[PDB]
Amino acid sequence: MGSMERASLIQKAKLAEQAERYEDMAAFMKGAVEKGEELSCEERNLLSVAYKNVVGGQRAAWRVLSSIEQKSNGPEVREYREKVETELQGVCDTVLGLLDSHLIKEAGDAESRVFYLKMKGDYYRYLAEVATGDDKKRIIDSARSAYQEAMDISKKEMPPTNPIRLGLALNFSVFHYEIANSPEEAISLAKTTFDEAMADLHTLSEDSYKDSTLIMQLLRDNLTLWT
């Protein structure tokens, strides 16, 4: 996308979202990141939405194929699960590469730095979901380390109702439950996050209250499923 203006890439990413063309959306936002300038709050959200939709479709397909393969246990099911898995890994490596070149290193404000470190944790988590063996171990630690740095910054720099702080805690709890085999850590983190946010709701406007309570309900939904 080197010959397209930054502002045109951002405009086309918004059009692609409206058209439900998420692969295009991700390609436009990759092009915008590769312009080298930092991203605004809205632009970070466009980047994240685009790639979450692309990898979300790949993960759903991988789970369908993995379930068929496990039931079967010719080469075709394994071959096709492997093709989807390689494509998914490639998308995760692309996102991680954007974060490493050079979004995280240039992110100084807590809102941008926590946002990017949460993304780093999420995309290592999606790598971990398909990883097998000792490879899994280093990938799992990379996810954990990114989430933990984001948690440490968020607890020092953001109020307990901040939606990025809340979504980070939600996703790190899912990491604990689903990836790290630490359901008790997942439940503790979700409960503490929910309770600390509850106690800070009185400080918020009506619109901020709606944003924070929406994510708190996701924490409660997981706690209900886990307990």
Partner: peptide, 9 residues
């Protein structure tokens, strides 16, 4: 369980 959907914005 569920992570942040994160698929609309």
């Amino acid at each position: 369980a569920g992570s942040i959907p994160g698929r609309r914005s």
